[PDB]
Design a protein around this ligand. Sequence first.
Ligand SMILES: [Ca+2]
Lengths: 269, 274, 269, 275
Amino acid sequence: DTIAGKLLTTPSRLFKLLIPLTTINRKDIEQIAILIHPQQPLSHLERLIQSEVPPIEDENGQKRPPFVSFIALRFIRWSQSTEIGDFIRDAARAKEFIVTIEGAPAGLEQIHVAVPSFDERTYFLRMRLRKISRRIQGLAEIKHECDALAHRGAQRVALGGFGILAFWWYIVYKLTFETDLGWDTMEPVTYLVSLSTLMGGYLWFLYHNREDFTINARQKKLYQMKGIDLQVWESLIDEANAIRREIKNIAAEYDVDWDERKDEQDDRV
Amino acid sequence: DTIAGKLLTTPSRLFKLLIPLTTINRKDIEQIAILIHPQQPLSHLERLIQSEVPPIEDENGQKRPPFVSFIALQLEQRFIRWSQSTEIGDFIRDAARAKEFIVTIEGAPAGLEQIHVAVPSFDERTYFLRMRLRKISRRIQGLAEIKHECDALAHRGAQRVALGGFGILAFWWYIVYKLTFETDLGWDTMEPVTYLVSLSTLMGGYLWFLYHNREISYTINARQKKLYQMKGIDLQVWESLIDEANAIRREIKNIAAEYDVDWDERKDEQDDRV
Amino acid sequence: DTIAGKLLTTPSRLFKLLIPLTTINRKDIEQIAILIHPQQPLSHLERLIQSEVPPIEDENGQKRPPFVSFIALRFIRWSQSTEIGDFIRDAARAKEFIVTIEGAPAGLEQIHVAVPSFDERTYFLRMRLRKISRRIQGLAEIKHECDALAHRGAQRVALGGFGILAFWWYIVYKLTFETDLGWDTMEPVTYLVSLSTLMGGYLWFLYHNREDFTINARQKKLYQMKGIDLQVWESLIDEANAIRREIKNIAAEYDVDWDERKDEQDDRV
Amino acid sequence: DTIAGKLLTTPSRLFKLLIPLTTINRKDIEQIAILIHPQQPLSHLERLIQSEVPPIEDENGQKRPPFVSFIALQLEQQRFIRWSQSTEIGDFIRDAARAKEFIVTIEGAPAGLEQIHVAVPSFDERTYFLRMRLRKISRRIQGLAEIKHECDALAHRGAQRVALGGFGILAFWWYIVYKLTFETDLGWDTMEPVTYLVSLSTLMGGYLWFLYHNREISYTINARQKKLYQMKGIDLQVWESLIDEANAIRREIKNIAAEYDVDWDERKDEQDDRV
Ligand SMILES: [Ca+2]
């Protein structure tokens, strides 16, 4: 109400702070809103506050605009070049922020805003990450059961092929080792059957048209039906880690340790 | 009508809005058009609407045109006043998630003395962006289909020579069967000729292993690269429309990231048909 | 006498203009430089010219800013919401630009600046395109020579292998089809040579260690020595086309037709 | 010293500049430390240097702030033009940075000349503070690349061993076929069917190994090795993160390199990784 304000984080990149000022023609309180970018100087915010307050009087004679001064944590004054990411950082550990406007105050000479923190600041991020990680998880398990399906079909068909070729081993062994028809009467059977399986291993090239199509390529053909491609997939995982390095940055610099399973424990509950 | 306005989204970058207020002698109220770029400050906007209104006769001197002020909703998951030199676009986004904002003139002729203007929606912003995206996306899907048919031409050009090879190998199977089973001649003269033929087809199957001559890929072949280009349709326009098409989806997903509404292009797969 | 002025394009993205103004208390002629990004609105430039000029007393009350008006080409006033790139576009067809401050100090009230051309602007692009065209050209022809070099060694080794294997055709034709040793005395020469051929592959696979390494892979290993990789290469070509689409944009908007060989005709002369 | 200055490049985003000027809090002339962010307007610099100087006494009596300015070199491919009081500092730094020229005109106070030249940091100087971190991260990804080469050496140990055993078995088969063939204790026509039977058996075993391609988890990444150098060795998330943090800086150095008309070649800094 009186000498107290708050700073809030947008869903976009920016900030906004709310300070009780006195405008050109108002009463003594009006919670005016100011939109700031965080990597930005501090003289910009000094100018942007001093645009909207009545100026200081002579002074013999000066109509010059007031001078704000962002003392923080006892009263360590901060310079006019430290960026707002760092000032909200060290002030965010301090949980305090003081804008002491002069001339305008008439002796009050103070304003206190309450800096948001890491749970609150990230909670906003966590929602972004919590949603996109759930969207990773569902597509992950559907892709896995498609993998099990194509694997099963491939090994069953290959097992059948080993069955018939083992049968060919058995009848050549017993035909030429029983010695009823000779090996001289067995040579044509071997070579002519070898061209016959070049035939039966070559018709499949032209009608049903394999033109590799190995074990892996049947699966890669298969979840074109049962799922989504890999570019969206790696975009989800890579951008998820891009968010995780940033929450590690902010929660590292705010110095409260954090792992993101602690809201997976609130996904179902 | 009187207390409702709307700010639309033009096909260009810059907005427009129409608000009713009193003017010179012609009429009591007219919804008048104001043209706005999203990078102009908010003082420019107030001045713009301060200019097309007859002033107030203000005593203690002459300070006659009014002082207007903007008000929105600070969502608590009230009404605060937005400062006079924010940029317009950031205020548009914040109050856009609030779905309302309020202009207040100083004249207060109306008892209410408020103007609740309406806020442009996700369907409208992404309506114009979706019309651009679907137009260029169709415009490359046709060239994708022409790629499919020249690929079918290469398929035909393969199936000819493959059919000839099957016929020749059937000829070989029949000539080995006739010169083998009949017994006019014993297997012990067809065996040597089989090994010699196997050497000759290992040679002919060895000179083909040098024939992998050009492979110009990027997904691109080399046998057809003269065919679909120097007789058909380009690839420079293909990759250029790819490059111009990849940018817009990120903007639609950023604005979509603002509005907390999910963006699915497969829910717009249904709009390319009816 | 100093109603002139000019605007110049920086080698960077954002460009500047030069106008004769009077800042605080000076002599009436002074160039002042103002930096402009061409995505900013017109009203922003209106504000920056309002910053450095004395105010105008207008009879209760004194407007602290003046008002300027960016009329152009027969005069058409332009609204203060257009893009500066568009106003430089249509004014660039017009080859004129007029700023008109309402206040006139002493019979002078106008200002003409001279909008520059695609010649100067696109030689701040043509210097870049010419340099990247030279780099791409030299690296291209070195890679082609390297490319030519690999295939000579590949055809020599393949031609030798076909030489000895054709010798293996002739020796098995002539030893047993027409001569004293029969096929029964020839079969283990064929099969035992076939395992002996295999031994060669194993030796090759282990000492000199080919673990495909086909004809293309000798090239791709070869210009790792003689040239540079493909990612930098396609980055240079793709960025070159990114510059070419932009000079096609600007010359498409300024409407003077252009092909970029017309400075390759000055790259040697 | 006298009329010279320098605007330095801190490792952070800020600048600093040291300019000599008379102040009666000090004795005669002190080079003073002023810091600058590149998004501050030039009015803040003229107010900042305007604040740490004792004022000019008004000859009208009543108005005593100093009035300072900035003047650069308009290049025509001399001539001097003054810069407005609300440009950002960074854009002016880039323009005068290719110009290699900077003056300041403090009104009234300068006894003689009143032309404080200062000197900008050349492209190499600006780059140096990027190239240190670029060289560091390139060095440690080179080291992790070398450890990847070490587990590659493990992989071909296994391959060589498996293949050596196969060559020994093939030598065994060549000797047993020669001994049971040339000796004329068994003729060829009882060794021929055993050869065809063995050929069927190795086509079966090749049909076993053609099934074996279970996992190929690539991105350039193997499947036998992925558990090998991670669950006992050194990570891969950190590898891709140093890739991601490493790819950004090169574009900035090439943008600033575009601003200075100087060819950026990383192979001319290949020579700096050794001495
Ligand atoms: Ca035989």
